[PDB]
Amino acid sequence: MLQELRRELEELSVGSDGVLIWKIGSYGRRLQEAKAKPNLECFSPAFYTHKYGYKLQVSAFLNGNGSGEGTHLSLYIRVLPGAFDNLLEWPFARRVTFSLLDQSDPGLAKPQHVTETFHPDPNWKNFQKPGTWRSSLGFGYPKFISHQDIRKRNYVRDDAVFIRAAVELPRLEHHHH
Amino acid sequence: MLQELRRELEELSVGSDGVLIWKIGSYGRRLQEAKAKPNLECFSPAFYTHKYGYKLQVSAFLNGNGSGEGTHLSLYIRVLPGAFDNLLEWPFARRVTFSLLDQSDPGLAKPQHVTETFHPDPNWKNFQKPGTSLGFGYPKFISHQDIRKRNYVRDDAVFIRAAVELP
Amino acid sequence: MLQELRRELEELSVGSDGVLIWKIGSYGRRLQEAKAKPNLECFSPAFYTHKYGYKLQVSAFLNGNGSGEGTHLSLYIRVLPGAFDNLLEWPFARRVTFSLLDQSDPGLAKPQHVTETFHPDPNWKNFQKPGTWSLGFGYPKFISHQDIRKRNYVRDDAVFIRAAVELPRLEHHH
Numbered sequence: 140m141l142q143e144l145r146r147e148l149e150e151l152s153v154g155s156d157g158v159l160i161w162k163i164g165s166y167g168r169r170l171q172e173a174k175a176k177p178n179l180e181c182f183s184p185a186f187y188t189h190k191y192g193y194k195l196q197v198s199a200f201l202n203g204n205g206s207g208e209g210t211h212l213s214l215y216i217r218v219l220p221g222a223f224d225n226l227l228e229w230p231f232a233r234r235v236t237f238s239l240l241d242q243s244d245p246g247l248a249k250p251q252h253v254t255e256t257f258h259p260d261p262n263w264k265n266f267q268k269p270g271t272w273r274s275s276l277g278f279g280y281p282k283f284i285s286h287q288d289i290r291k292r293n294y295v296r297d298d299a300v301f302i303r304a305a306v307e308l309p310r311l312e313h314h315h316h
Numbered sequence: 317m318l319q320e321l322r323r324e325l326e327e328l329s330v331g332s333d334g335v336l337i338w339k340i341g342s343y344g345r346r347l348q349e350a351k352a353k354p355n356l357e358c359f360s361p362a363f364y365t366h367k368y369g370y371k372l373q374v375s376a377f378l379n380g381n382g383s384g385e386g387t388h389l390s391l392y393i394r395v396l397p398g399a400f401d402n403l404l405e406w407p408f409a410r411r412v413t414f415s416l417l418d419q420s421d422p423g424l425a426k427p428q429h430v431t432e433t434f435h436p437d438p439n440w441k442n443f444q445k446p447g448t449s450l451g452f453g454y455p456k457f458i459s460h461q462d463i464r465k466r467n468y469v470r471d472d473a474v475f476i477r478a479a480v481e482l483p
Numbered sequence: 484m485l486q487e488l489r490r491e492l493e494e495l496s497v498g499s500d501g502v503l504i505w506k507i508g509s510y511g512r513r514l515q516e517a518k519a520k521p522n523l524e525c526f527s528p529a530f531y532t533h534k535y536g537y538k539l540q541v542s543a544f545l546n547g548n549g550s551g552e553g554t555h556l557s558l559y560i561r562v563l564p565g566a567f568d569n570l571l572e573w574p575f576a577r578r579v580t581f582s583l584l585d586q587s588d589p590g591l592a593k594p595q596h597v598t599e600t601f602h603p604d605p606n607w608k609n610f611q612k613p614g615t616w617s618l619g620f621g622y623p624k625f626i627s628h629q630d631i632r633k634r635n636y637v638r639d640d641a642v643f644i645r646a647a648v649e650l651p652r653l654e655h656h657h
């Protein structure tokens with residue numbers, strides 16, 4: 140079926156340091172479609188923070204929404220219902236970094252990524268345990284990058300863009316006892 | 317093929333990590349099924365100890381078998397024929413830890429897992445090289461009364477953890 | 484579709500430190516198939532050096548090609564076009580190690596793998612950026628037909644080809 144294809148798309152990546160790299164291809168056609176249909180939303184494959192961890196999903200508005208409608212690219216992340224939610228602490232409080240990657244060869248010039256970092260609001264409600272609020276609203280930036288800034292370097296290359304969503308590892312001390 | 321590909325897909329979800337977390341949902345329906353059919357066996361997805369390592373499988377009796385039939389949940393592990401068996405040392409002698417997990421929020425109370433650990437017996441026929449079942453485990457892993465004593469059954473679901481030691 | 488089992492074979496292997504273990508079964512049937520069709524090439528599943536890294540593929544001539552046709556097994560590796568090529572440095576310059584494994588129990592006797600190692604030449608054509616420029620790189624005489632039978636290289640009518648790519652470790656400030 141098509142859920143089988145979605146499953147295989149999800150397995151990149153398995154609980155890998157919270158790092159998802161989402162390639163949005165045919166950039167011009169998707170941008171035209173978004174300009175023709177306001178509030179057109181693209182969805183990344185669902186990805187887990189760690190093995191048996193939080194299930195997250197990144198979404199993008201190529202023509203922007205909210206304060207960025209028509210002028211910017213908008214980036215959001217949302218917690219999804221996961222099979223292991225009962226084994227994780229809530230609310231979700233792991234630091235997240237969005238990045239629009241500069242597709243430049245690292246050997247000829249240092250890339251300048253458009254990077255932003257945020258800490259989940261304990262009161263954002265969506266970062267609370269799934270199934271508590273029967274919003275459904277991702278958290279992020281409506282003005283992540285402007286339409287003019289996205290053409291200023293190698294952000295769009297071969298009609299494709301790269302969005303890197305990295306979730307921070309908590310790191311703790313023992314315990315021991 | 318589609319059903320068998322679903323199978324292979326849920327096999328990939330595990331690793332290679334050596335840590336398997338097996339979620340058994342609709343606990344009540346399956347417990348009644350096991351009570352209606354003695355020795356009814358549930359099977360975990362096959363999972364590898366490491367990349368290109370031993371292929372293992374966990375099996376469970378929700379109504380118990382052997383000394384625990386009708387009173388306990390029984391947990392066993394068995395070695396399966398793996399594609400890389402000719403590249404591994406035998407007999408399988410890596411420490412194994414079974415856990416029935418307490419589905420409690422770690423931020424509100426520290427969970428109390430029901431854990432058991434064993435080292436593979438060199439003379440247990442199943443831990444020998446396949447072809448050159450015979451599962452090993454505990455018939456009295458947890459009693460029917462103790463499995464209701466905390467958050468072991470939550471939202472009609474149970475979690476069986478099987479952790480294999482690193483080389 | 485059937486193309487999905489192919490991708491399930493792929494990512495059952497890729498993410499690891501550039502280490503692909505390719506199991507070629509029914510060795511005898513495929514060997515006489517290659518003997519019946521010169522230059523018959525077997526292909527490993529595509530595998531990535533790291534997550535979002537280079538996409539590589541190993542290929543084999545069971546009856547050999549080039550200087551080893553009819554006498555040896557020939558082993559090659561090739562860079563394939565990957566979705567993240569624009570985020571990687573070129574040319575590919577990660578050291579590669581081929582190994583034919585001696586399928587012997589490591590606890591009763593030490594295996595003797597047939598191992599060869601190379602560092603990719605920066606002026607090699609295939610190691611340049613895919614599309615922005617098929618000649619794989621490798622060994623035509625990796626192992627002879629007689630040497631592949633001398634130990635447990637062929638066991639239970641199966642062979643194991645290990646291709647390991649070395650990872651770097653560059654770093655900066657605090």
Ligand SMILES: O=C(Nc1nccs1)c1ccc2nccnc2c1
Binds near residue numbers: 204205276278279
């Ligand atoms: O209002 C939003 N976000 C924030 N407000 C404050 C901080 S982040 C917002 C708007 C539209 C969305 N469409 C899809 C997914 N998530 C969305 C989130």
Ligand SMILES: O=C(Nc1nccs1)c1ccc2nccnc2c1
Binds near residue numbers: 450451
């Ligand atoms: O007798 C068993 N185990 C032990 N005997 C002694 C120590 S552990 C036993 C019983 C039932 C099983 N059903 C399925 C798979 N494996 C099983 C193993």
Ligand SMILES: O=C(Nc1nccs1)c1ccc2nccnc2c1
Binds near residue numbers: 622
């Ligand atoms: O000429 C080759 N390799 C080298 N030449 C010099 C050093 S390694 C060669 C020959 C045949 C091939 N057939 C398929 C894939 N790759 C191949 C590579």
